[PDB]
Amino acid sequence: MRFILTGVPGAGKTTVCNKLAEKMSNLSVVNYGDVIFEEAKKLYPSIIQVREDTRKLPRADYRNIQIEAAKKISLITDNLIVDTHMSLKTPYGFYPGLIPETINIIQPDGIILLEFNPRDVIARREKDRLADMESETDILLHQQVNRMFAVSYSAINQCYVKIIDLTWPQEYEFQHTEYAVNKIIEMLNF
Amino acid sequence: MRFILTGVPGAGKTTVCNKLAEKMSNLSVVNYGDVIFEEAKKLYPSIIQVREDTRKLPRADYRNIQIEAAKKISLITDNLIVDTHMSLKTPYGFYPGLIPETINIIQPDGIILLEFNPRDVIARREKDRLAGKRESETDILLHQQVNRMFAVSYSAINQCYVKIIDLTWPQEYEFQHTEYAVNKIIEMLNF
Amino acid sequence: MRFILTGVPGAGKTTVCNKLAEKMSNLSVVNYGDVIFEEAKKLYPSIIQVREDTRKLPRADYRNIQIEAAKKISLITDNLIVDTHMSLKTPYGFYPGLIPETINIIQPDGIILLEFNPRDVIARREKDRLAGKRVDMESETDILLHQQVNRMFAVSYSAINQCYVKIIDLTWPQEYEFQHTEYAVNKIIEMLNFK
């Protein structure tokens, strides 16, 4: 099956992705941003070198890069999970991290939203930073906006909208990760 | 005045639809789900024998039976209410009951959303279950919120009304919620 | 850059618009409804005496009037702020204040939503009723519902056309009068001049 996987940044989504790729063989976990960056360097090497450089392309070139990345991802046969962000915050507001062509090419079966507790998000972000400074309301608003984006994409393309709740206190560290991964594989095997 | 009536399952939507069909003249109350089930069954008599078996069909064939159901119920003239669910929950999450083709084929004027109180919903569901006629507060409220989002998206795309009848208040007597909703819908139709 | 400023009516949106016009140079602030009314009067002077008379129209002609108003608004060159509504409460429910033709013709860089505290909304509605004209009055929950529906409309237009969705929070309590207006104007200006 095919699912997009999303959530606010810095909350532990990458750990979920890697522990999924670790605890299932018939699975492919890919990052839309990584494929976008690869296709960009291959088509526009004279300009691109790091993720940060993907901003300098015009919106038409960036759209074509997203389209080609979605295509290359489309040629995957096994159970697929596409890690990405539905919305990202900017000085102008929330900007969608996807485009309708992405979904109608990848044609995923569903969209999975990892909804964490804002306090936990702040804690994880601060920890990883010691290795942006939002508040609880900012993160809650971001998650509700992501809900709305997912529901819009679903209404347009008719797909599933799974909301995985990780807003409960962990009994042991990294438990949210295991709960998310176990429920995701339960979905994949049914 | 053709409207799409929706709400979380097991809360009282069907009683509202029935009392509408009984109290309103020149009003056709049609169940999108039953029509889809019938059409799918008759066009694929081998693979389809229960309602939720309609998920095995490939994307194209399911969308085609939905298109045929929408065309069939669009032929109805005058005023009609379409009983249906805007989203149903499954092991894979929330799944929509409509598609843009369905909406612009039925070309409805508005979408009515019956938003109940989750406690009332739990009570109704269990009372029905005990009578052999067939989630948590948080889950029900999330379902209603995603239904609201779906309805707003459909309205933004097709330009239609989004009526939200709020039955979250405690009843003073049985069937007060459904009576209030039916009367609001009838004053809407007559307006 | 082009932004569509919106929010529930009677809460101070036009105050923000007029003060933006008064503070920042090279900023054109246009009211979609005003343009629509002018064009309606132009093409149908036999029926349109005032704004509400626009209900007399059939929906197709009014939609085309909206399209012509959006066209005229798109002809503007520099920084633009289109004051309008994402939804309107009617007997039949919420109706979108925009149409897809508006989004496509204006190509707005973003949408902006002023989210108020319903108490302030009600108080300002009743005050502007007292001190002047503007002859179904809503409640707190109704206003919250309206704001959430507008948020959903905005996210939908963004997901469909890929534009920004800025939410300016004016829910906190004002320490002095018109503080929300100053805050909204300052934030919109900071956003426009961002480099």
Ligand SMILES: Nc1ccn([C@@H]2O[C@H](COP(=O)(O)OP(=O)(O)OP(=O)(O)O)[C@@H](O)[C@H]2O)c(=O)n1
């Ligand atoms: N249950 C968890 C999951 C994650 N973390 C911490 O939170 C951060 C996770 O970051 P990451 O998974 O990389 O965040 P994303 O949401 O995936 O976004 P980005 O690529 O920007 O990091 C790390 O410090 C990780 O140790 C944690 O403390 N407890």
Ligand SMILES: Nc1ccn([C@@H]2O[C@H](COP(=O)(O)OP(=O)(O)OP(=O)(O)O)[C@@H](O)[C@H]2O)c(=O)n1
């Ligand atoms: N105001 C109400 C509305 C409903 N009910 C009870 O709730 C059930 C009616 O729900 P129904 O309208 O049948 O819900 P559906 O929309 O039919 O949901 P489903 O498809 O799951 O049945 C019946 O037990 C009815 O007595 C009630 O007690 N008071």
Ligand SMILES: Nc1ccn([C@@H]2O[C@H](COP(=O)(O)OP(=O)(O)OP(=O)(O)O)[C@@H](O)[C@H]2O)c(=O)n1
């Ligand atoms: N921070 C603010 C902003 C506005 N107002 C009051 O709110 C009233 C109504 O706001 P208005 O300026 O009329 O803005 P709109 O919301 O755009 O009104 P309408 O939709 O009726 O045009 C005004 O009289 C103004 O004094 C206020 O008290 N405090």
